């Protein structure tokens, strides 16, 4: 993956960045699942880590002909009026590489609850003796406000910057551009 | 409704980032609305004299 | 010495109605008179309102209707006669010299692109915009637009745009009653997210008699945002047509009065010391002006 393609959001009277980033991380994730593999990253190279806000970039990490595929691909319509795209460029080299992954909380504790119930055939009670609502933790961490097709729910997607290193190991990326272990290039 | 401020400031509150620290707390209001409905474009007004 | 009237209430041209929003199918959109209302339904996460379409149906018809009034320039209510008199050959200066042959045409590009489909047009496959010419109760003349061709952000020419730029022109100068129905399909997909619009239980959505709607001063907002003529950084396109030209997203008023560009400074001096400002100024106050207000000091 030594090509990559930048997406900046425009700024709009009407919509946040962060709505906008939920929206075109939503249809990313449906256009890779339509492409399928596993060679697309994705990258935010505007990202503050202080704020945990995800920036106003998106990049895409790929081969050349897949991006030259998703370019021309219409999952870009009706979002054209809100962002920019550069070309499909190759990378830089020196660049360091960090891991972008999605990491997910137990911020509810009566979903666990439901499970030991269904999995152990327990009470109410003793479910919630076992699970306390301590368990219940948060995340400081950037993140998209996605829904689903399969299922009707709104999830918040969160994601974390990996520490940055000097080389890449093999492996494959999720249908969202994040990482199953995969690396992408940071610049 | 919901709006911003549109009215006339009076030369003390002109200032740009007081400006923008009022329209960034917006003014909301209900109010009270008679529409046409969707499927009736005449208005009748009776009254007797 | 011609001071600014203590009273300036303008009514607002370009009247529209509250946003209806129904649910259908896709390439049935001509047979879109009997389709399912948009209802707004419950669900417990807190109790929230949400508004979405059925299971089968992957295309939301939001239909409205626009009222194109005229005589902009003129006020509801205005204390000194002499200021009326000089705003309204002012007013009568900018249409003999150029009619709304410019702010019609934006309007019609707001009409023409579905900006009025607030948040459930940006990630639609495709929005198709039709615009009715409703005279003595049938269409005098239709539009059928695309509103994904046609952008947000720039103001491109085309043949009907034109069409609907002079119709619009006419019923603004006071030549004509034009009543436009403007109807608009969005193909977001099967049992997806619709957005009305939002009342003030965390969330309450707006509907009419259980059907979903956007409110009329939302799409009047969507239908004002023609105001490129400002001070522009950041690669900002249009904004809402406002007085000290502010946007809520960014916190930021552009055409602050430090500057010499918000309504106020420059209809002051247009009128009253005759300082004319430029051509796209002067759209922009004459924008205002339809937008309507309660101008005038206290």
Same mark, same amino acid.
């Given at each position: 993956?030594? =090509?990559?393609?930048?997406?900046?959001?425009?700024?709009?009277?009407?919509? *946040? *960045?962060?709505?906008?980033?939920?929206?075109?991380?939503?249809?990313?994730?449906? $256009?890779?699942?339509?492409?399928? #593999?596993?060679?697309? #990253?994705?990258?935010?190279?505007?990202? !503050?880590?202080?704020?945990?806000?995800?920036?106003?970039?998106?990049?895409?990490?790929?081969?050349?002909?897949?991006?030259? $595929?998703?370019?021309?691909?219409?999952?870009?319509?009706?979002?054209?009026? =809100?962002?920019?795209?550069?070309?499909? &460029?190759?990378?830089? =080299?020196?660049?360091?590489?960090?891991?972008?992954?999605?990491?997910?909380?137990?911020?509810?504790?009566?979903?666990?609850?439901?499970?030991?119930?269904?999995?152990? !055939?327990?009470?109410?009670?003793?479910?919630?003796?076992?699970? *306390?609502?301590?368990?219940?933790? &948060?995340?400081?961490?950037?993140?998209?406000?996605?829904?689903?097709?399969?299922?009707?729910?709104?999830?918040?997607?969160?994601?974390? =910057? #990996?520490?940055?290193?000097?080389?890449?190991?093999?492996?494959?990326?999720?249908?969202?551009?994040?990482?199953?272990?995969?690396?992408? *290039?940071?610049? | 409704?919901?709006?911003?401020?549109?009215?006339?400031?009076?030369?003390?509150?002109?200032?740009?980032?007081?400006?923008?620290?009022?329209?960034?707390?917006?003014?909301?209001?209900?109010?009270?609305?008679?529409?046409?409905?969707?499927?009736?474009?005449?208005?009748?007004?009776?009254?007797?004299? | 010495?011609?001071?600014? @009237?203590?009273?300036?209430?303008?009514?607002?041209?370009?009247? %529209?109605?509250? /946003?209806?929003?129904?649910? +259908?199918?896709?390439?049935?959109?001509?047979?879109?008179?009997?389709?399912?209302?948009?209802?707004?339904?419950?669900?417990?996460?807190?109790?929230?309102?949400?508004?979405?379409? %059925?299971?089968?149906?992957?295309?939301?018809?939001?239909?409205?209707?626009?009222?194109?009034?005229?005589?902009?320039?003129? %006020?509801?209510?205005?204390?000194?006669? /002499?200021?009326?008199?000089?705003?309204?050959?002012?007013?009568?200066?900018?249409?003999?010299?150029?009619?709304?042959?410019?702010? /019609?045409?934006?309007?019609?590009?707001?009409?023409?692109?579905?900006?009025?489909?607030?948040?459930?047009?940006?990630? /639609?496959?495709?929005?198709?915009?039709?615009?009715?010419?409703?005279?003595?109760?049938?269409?005098?003349?239709?539009?059928?637009?695309?509103?994904?061709?046609?952008?947000?952000?720039?103001?491109?020419?085309?043949?009907?745009?034109?069409?609907?730029?002079?119709?619009?022109?006419?019923?603004?100068?006071?030549?004509?009653?034009?009543?436009?129905?403007?109807?608009?399909?969005?193909?977001?997909?099967? +049992?997806?997210?619709?957005?009305?619009?939002?009342?003030?239980?965390?969330?309450?959505?707006?509907?009419?008699?259980?059907?979903? @709607?956007?409110?009329?001063?939302?799409?009047?907002?969507?239908?004002?945002?023609?105001?490129?003529?400002?001070?522009?950084?950041?690669?900002?396109?249009?904004?809402?047509?406002?007085?000290?030209?502010?946007?809520?997203?960014?916190?930021?008023?552009?055409?602050? %009065?430090?500057?010499?560009?918000?309504?106020?400074?420059?209809?002051?001096?247009?009128?009253?010391?005759?300082?004319?400002?430029?051509?796209?100024?002067?759209?922009?106050?004459?924008?205002?002006?339809?937008?309507?207000?309660?101008?005038?000091?206290?």
């Amino acid at each position: 993956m030594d =090509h990559y393609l930048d997406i900046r959001l425009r700024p709009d009277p009407e919509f *946040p *960045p962060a709505q906008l980033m939920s929206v075109l991380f939503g249809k990313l994730h449906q $256009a890779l699942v339509a492409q399928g #593999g596993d060679r697309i #990253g994705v990258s935010f190279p505007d990202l !503050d880590e202080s704020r945990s806000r995800l920036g106003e970039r998106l990049r895409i990490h790929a081969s050349a002909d897949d991006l030259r $595929a998703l370019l021309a691909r219409p999952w870009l319509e009706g979002l054209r009026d =809100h962002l920019q795209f550069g070309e499909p &460029a190759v990378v830089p =080299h020196p660049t360091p590489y960090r891991q972008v992954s999605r990491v997910q909380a137990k911020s509810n504790p009566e979903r666990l609850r439901r499970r030991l119930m269904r999995r152990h !055939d327990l009470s109410e009670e003793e479910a919630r003796k076992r699970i *306390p609502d301590t368990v219940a933790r &948060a995340l400081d961490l950037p993140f998209v406000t996605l829904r689903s097709q399969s299922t009707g729910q709104h999830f918040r997607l969160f994601i974390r =910057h #990996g520490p940055l290193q000097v080389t890449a190991e093999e492996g494959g990326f999720t249908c969202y551009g994040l990482s199953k272990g995969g690396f992408v *290039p940071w610049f | 409704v919901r709006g911003t401020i549109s009215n006339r400031l009076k030369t003390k509150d002109r200032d740009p980032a007081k400006l923008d620290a009022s329209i960034q707390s917006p003014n909301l209001q209900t109010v009270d609305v008679a529409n046409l409905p969707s499927d009736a474009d005449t208005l009748k007004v009776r009254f007797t004299l | 010495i011609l001071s600014t @009237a203590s009273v300036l209430a303008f009514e607002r041209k370009l009247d %529209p109605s509250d /946003a209806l929003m129904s649910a +259908g199918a896709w390439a049935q959109r001509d047979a879109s008179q009997e389709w399912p209302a948009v209802t707004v339904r419950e669900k417990s996460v807190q109790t929230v309102d949400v508004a979405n379409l %059925p299971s089968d149906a992957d295309t939301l018809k939001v239909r409205f209707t626009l009222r194109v009034l005229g005589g902009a320039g003129t %006020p509801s209510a205005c204390n000194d006669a /002499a200021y009326r008199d000089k705003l309204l050959q002012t007013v009568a200066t900018y249409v003999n010299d150029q009619g709304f042959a410019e702010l /019609a045409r934006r309007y019609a590009h707001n009409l023409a692109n579905a900006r009025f489909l607030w948040r459930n047009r940006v990630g /639609a496959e495709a929005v198709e915009v039709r615009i009715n010419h409703i005279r003595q109760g049938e269409v005098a003349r239709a539009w059928r637009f695309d509103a994904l061709a046609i952008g947000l952000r720039d103001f491109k020419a085309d043949a009907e745009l034109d069409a609907l730029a002079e119709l619009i022109a006419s019923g603004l100068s006071g030549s004509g009653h034009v009543l436009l129905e403007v109807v608009a399909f969005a193909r977001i997909g099967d +049992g997806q997210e619709v957005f009305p619009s939002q009342e003030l239980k965390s969330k309450t959505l707006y509907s009419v008699r259980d059907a979903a @709607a956007i409110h009329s001063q939302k799409i009047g907002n969507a239908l004002r945002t023609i105001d490129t003529w400002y001070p522009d950084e950041d690669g900002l396109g249009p904004i809402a047509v406002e007085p000290y030209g502010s946007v809520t997203s960014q916190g930021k008023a552009y055409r602050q %009065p430090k500057q010499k560009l918000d309504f106020y400074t420059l209809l002051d001096n247009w009128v009253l010391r005759d300082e004319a400002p430029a051509v796209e100024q002067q759209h922009y106050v004459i924008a205002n002006l339809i937008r309507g207000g309660v101008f005038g000091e206290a």
